[PDB]
Amino acid sequence: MDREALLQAVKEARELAKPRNFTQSFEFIATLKEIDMRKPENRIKTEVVLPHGRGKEAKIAVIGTGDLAKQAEELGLTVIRKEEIEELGKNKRKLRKIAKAHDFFIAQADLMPLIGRYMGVILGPRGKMPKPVPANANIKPLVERLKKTVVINTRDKPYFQVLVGNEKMTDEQIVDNIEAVLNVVAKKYEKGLYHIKDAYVKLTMGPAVKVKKE
RNA sequence: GGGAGUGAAGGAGGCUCGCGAACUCGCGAAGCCGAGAAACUUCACUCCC
């Protein structure tokens, strides 16, 4: 529908931006319409998987023991084993960094009551509260699912931002990445696809390219 | 599409200066903020003319 639009909208931002000493990632910003941001009414705190995903696999880490914690290493992930949970809670500088380094966290479920009490504080209101993992479960259907998961939270404000690619991936690829990010929209109450004002996209060190066609 | 502040998004970078007949090409132990939410690029909400 407005595919051609957003498509031109992004061809415009690839050169509308400077080369860099690393690679820029694409972000889409959205300006809402009529709501109140004050009602339980959807605030979008959901997460919906990205089709072609990013160019950068999300980063995961796990809190657990032995077997659960075993899936980790061979899976290439980083891991925080029990005792270190304390050792960390009394060393916040590191505690933090870790958090700014890993998109997601999964916990040996029965291990939350050590987490909340020890990693908790400097973790939760930073979006890093780790998700529980039942007893002895299989991780890949989720973890593997996550390397491409993208978050869509906004707290109480009529706007939002999400990643939807990386300078390395391709034009069209992003589109749908976005398109898809939008289906989130339609499902609520009655928010067709147009309950927002404008929409720009641009990457890390580039210009917020405008919303329309030509 | 002048500036303030606050918020949230991407982020490991960003930016100056010197020498060669040399714009962003080469050479430079030359310097300045940053990977601590706070550098850099932004968007929006309340301002200020």
Curated annotation (Swiss-Prot):
Top-rank taxon, per record: Archaea
GO molecular function terms attached to this record: rRNA binding; structural constituent of ribosome; tRNA binding
GO cellular component: large ribosomal subunit
Gene3D superfamilies: 3.30.190.20, 3.40.50.790
InterPro entries referenced in this protein's UniProt entry, alphabetically: Ribosomal_uL1 (IPR002143), Ribosomal_uL1-like (IPR023674), Ribosomal_uL1/biogenesis (IPR028364), Ribosomal_uL1_3-a/b-sand (IPR016095), Ribosomal_uL1_arc (IPR023669), Ribosomal_uL1_CS (IPR023673)
Signal peptide location: none
SUPFAM superfamilies, alphabetized: Ribosomal protein L1 (SSF56808)
Summary of the function given for this chain in its UniProt record: Probably involved in E site tRNA release. Binds directly to 23S rRNA.
Subunit record text: Part of the 50S ribosomal subunit.
Protein name as catalogued: Large ribosomal subunit protein uL1
Organism this protein belongs to: Methanocaldococcus jannaschii (strain ATCC 43067 / DSM 2661 / JAL-1 / JCM 10045 / NBRC 100440) (Methanococcus jannaschii)
Upper taxonomic lineage: Archaea, Methanobacteriati, Methanobacteriota, Methanomada group, Methanococci
